[PDB]
C-alpha cells in the first residue's frame, strides 16, 4: 500500500500539498513517497518500476513505447526577469532578442522553450547567458541579474524572491508544454494511485 511517484516543480508547489492533504483523508492507510522528477530523467525509473508514475511536462512523441501518457493540463509558461528589468514592459519576443537568458530545464533540454519560441517567429537564437537547471535556484539567480528566463507561472508566484521579480506581459505565443501522467501502460492503475492523480488534477485547476 505504497505509492512512489515523481512530481514536476509546478505540481510540487501548488497542486501537490493540497492533493496530499485531500488524499490522506480519503486513503489514510497509504504511504506516499514523492520525489522530484522531470522528463526524460524519470523515464528509466518508470521503466524499471522504481516509480509507479511521474507527473511532468513532456511531448507525446518523445515518450518511449513502454509509457503511456495521460495528459492532465497545459502548462502556463511566463518570461521572468528582475522587477526593474529594461524589458519588463515588453509585449513581443522581437523586443527581447538582445537580452541574455538563463536557460532553464525543459523536456527537450535547457532553454528549449525560449529557443523554440524565438525560432517559431523567425528570430535568431536567444543569447545564452547561463544554464540553470535548478528550478529551486532559478528565481534568486534571475532576481540578482539582468537575465530573463522562462518558468511555469506557479513557480513565478511561489518563490521566496517574488517581490524582486516581474513577469513580461508578452502578447506573442509561447509553446506551453503539456503536463502528463507518465506510467508503464502494462502497469494496472491501483485505486489509490488513480485517487491521488485525480486530486492533483482537481487542485491544479
Ligand atoms: C517550461 C516548463 C518546465 C517545467 C514545467 S513543470 O514540469 O510543470 O514544472 C512546466 C513548464
Ligand atoms: C546571479 C547572476 C548570474 C549571472 C550573471 S551574468 O552572467 O552577469 O548575467 C549575473 C548574476
Ligand atoms: C492556469 C495555469 C495553468 C498552468 C500553470 S503552471 O503549471 O504554473 O504552468 C499555471 C496556471
UniProtKB/Swiss-Prot annotation:
Keyword annotations: DNA-binding, Plasmid, Transcription, Transcription regulation
Binding site for toluene-4-sulfonate: 8, 10
Activity control summary: Sensitive to oxygen.
GO MF term list: DNA binding; DNA-binding transcription factor activity
Gene Ontology CC entries for this record: cytosol
Oligomer and partners: Homotetramer. Dimer of dimers related by a twofold axis.
Role this protein plays: Regulates expression of the tsaMBCD1 operon and of tsaT in response to p-toluenesulfonate (TSA). Acts by binding directly to the promoter region. Binding to the tsa promoter depends on TSA concentration.
Family: Belongs to the LysR transcriptional regulatory family.
Name the record gives this protein: HTH-type transcriptional regulator TsaR
Native source organism of the sequence: Comamonas testosteroni
First-to-last residue of the parent protein present: 91 to 295 of 298
Amino acid at each position: 500500500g505504497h505509492i512512489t511517484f515523481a512530481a514536476s516543480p509546478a505540481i510540487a508547489l501548488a497542486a501537490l500539498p493540497l492533493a496530499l492533504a485531500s488524499f490522506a483523508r480519503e486513503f489514510p492507510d497509504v504511504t506516499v513517497n514523492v520525489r522530484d522528477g522531470m522528463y526524460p530523467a524519470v523515464s528509466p525509473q518508470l521503466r524499471d518500476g522504481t516509480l509507479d508514475f511521474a507527473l511532468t511536462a513532456a511531448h507525446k512523441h518523445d515518450i518511449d513505447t513502454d509509457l503511456e501518457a495521460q495528459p492532465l493540463y497545459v502548462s502556463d509558461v511566463v518570461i521572468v526577469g528582475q522587477r526593474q528589468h529594461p524589458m519588463a514592459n515588453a509585449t513581443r519576443l522581437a523586443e527581447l532578442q538582445e537580452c541574455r537568458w538563463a536557460f532553464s530545464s525543459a523536456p527537450r533540454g535547457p532553454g528549449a522553450i525560449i529557443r523554440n519560441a524565438f525560432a517559431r517567429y523567425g528570430l535568431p537564437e536567444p543569447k545564452l547567458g547561463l544554464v540553470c537547471e535548478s528550478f529551486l535556484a532559478l528565481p534568486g539567480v534571475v532576481a540578482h541579474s539582468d537575465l530573463l528566463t522562462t518558468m511555469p507561472r506557479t513557480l513565478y508566484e511561489r518563490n521566496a524572491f517574488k517581490d524582486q521579480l516581474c513577469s513580461i506581459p508578452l502578447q506573442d505565443a509561447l509553446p506551453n508544454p503539456t503536463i502528463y501522467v507518465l506510467r508503464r501502460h502494462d502497469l494496472p492503475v491501483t485505486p489509490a494511485a488513480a485517487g491521488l492523480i485525480r486530486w492533483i488534477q482537481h487542485h491544479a485547476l
